[model samples]
Target: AQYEDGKQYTTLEKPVAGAPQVLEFFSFFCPHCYQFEEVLHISDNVKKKLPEGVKMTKYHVNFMGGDLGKDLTQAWAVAMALGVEDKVTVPLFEGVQKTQTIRSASDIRDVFINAGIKGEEYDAAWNSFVVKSLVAQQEKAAADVQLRGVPAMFVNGKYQLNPQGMDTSNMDVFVQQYADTVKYLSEK
Candidate 1:
């Protein structure tokens, strides 16, 4: 199926300011976000097909985790700073959303510890100016979008994907079509 603007996605009146790239918003507290990683495998599949130099930047949205949201978002920033996102993303999601084992910053720290990041190192990164700044930026971006849900995708911060418009009954087709939509939008 071909991707259409109004049918598959809607353009933002004010496109977010950024270079041509995919900006994703998800929260550690979102079950569907966890399913996207654990079940659909959308991130890995779509990332492989993305146009060169057009990368997907994920921001951990801060609305769902309640009081723990801020701390979890900081942990995400720290993971990216340490280049261990691929290592810890699943565990964080599983712990926070699935097992419900995470409740405090220390609990989040334990997950990073299991990923082989030192406690001291995690503290430093969490407190680092870069990570703090990224945390702030991520929260601000979440609010800027007036985001209403998790696992949301925006191409070049201009086009927001409408997941309902895609066929989701077949997992294989869904992934391909999702990637196609992102690929199509990223090119615009």
Candidate 2:
């Protein structure tokens, strides 16, 4: 558990200057995370409206609670360590959403391989020191934040916006509220 302190806790130190930094903490196995992906992608327009230096970062939270969580945590840690987050981020989310058949490490490995990451690279990345640290950091965040659910958003480290709290009856309105919150924080 040797995480880069800055990378793991940037919001605390940097404080998201100019515009608010929105960090979405999620788990791949969470159904809400799956639903949020569409909103997140479409929010690119909202992202463009932010002042310079503002950005969004997605933290894939992982803890060893079940087989799926363990497998995803390992895969995500390895992906982050290798600096191939973009390579696996979307695909991993999509893969989990698409198939109930993938519930084991071997199955997860195949998902990674299908995403174009070689087996050797994946193994090496997963075993790296950085990844080990990230896993530890992820656990720490979960505990310190008293997280009760996934698809949580932290705006400049001050607010915890849970999508689960939103009214699912109106997905568009909820998404607009989320985007508006981000915009408001960006200018604050």
Candidate 3:
């Protein structure tokens, strides 16, 4: 798929500020997003791939427009600010979609706390002005993108990797599509 002009994917009208910054726009409430947990844990292999200026960032979408969705969205921004997403994100999704143990804001906060985020530090990030701002930013971006669905990838803000659409019935295929598409487009 590596052609000189990247004809396989759509190019953004204006590339994201850092160029290679690929934002994962998702939601914990979505079963599809929860399923994507499989690809998120590539860990060292993923770590190795991220530093070539291709920053993989996460955005918790608010498409549901409800209490649980918004709470989880804010919780993710807080987890990210605390630098515990790599450790807490999977648990967050599982607690919601699988374990049924994490629902309210306090529950999500406890997941971070139990993961060793500490009270003061956790509260600091949970209540931080910037954390709230980032959530707002993601929400606004969600609106701007006019997302057709969740579990989507947007490279450089304007280019959506799943322009062809998702096979909602097959979670494995969906996540794999994004993983390969991202890897292929990152070097462009």
TM-score of each: 0.94, 0.74, 0.75
Stretches of candidate 2 exceeding 4 Å from the true structure: 1-20, 39-46, 63-65, 162-173
Q: How accurate locally is residue 160 in candidate 1, as Cα lDDT from 0 to 100?
A: 90
Which is the winner by TM-score between candidate 2 and candidate 3? Answer: 3
- Residues 42-147, candidate 3: write the lDDT tens digits: 2223335444656667788876637888888888888777777788977887788788997688888888888888889878887899899979878777766666
True-structure RMSD, every candidate: 1.5, 8.1, 4.1
What is candidate 2's lDDT per residue for 117-169, written digit by digit as tens?
A: 89998887777887888787666655555666776666666555544444557
Q: Which model is ahead, 1 or 3, in terms of lDDT? A: 1
**How many clashes in each structure?**
0, 2, 0
Put the candidates in lDDT order, highest first.
Answer: 1, 3, 2
Which stretches of candidate 1 lie above 4 Å from their native place? none
Estimate candidate 2's alpha-carbon lDDT, on a 0 to 1 scale: 0.64
Worst 10 residues of 3 by lDDT: 38-47
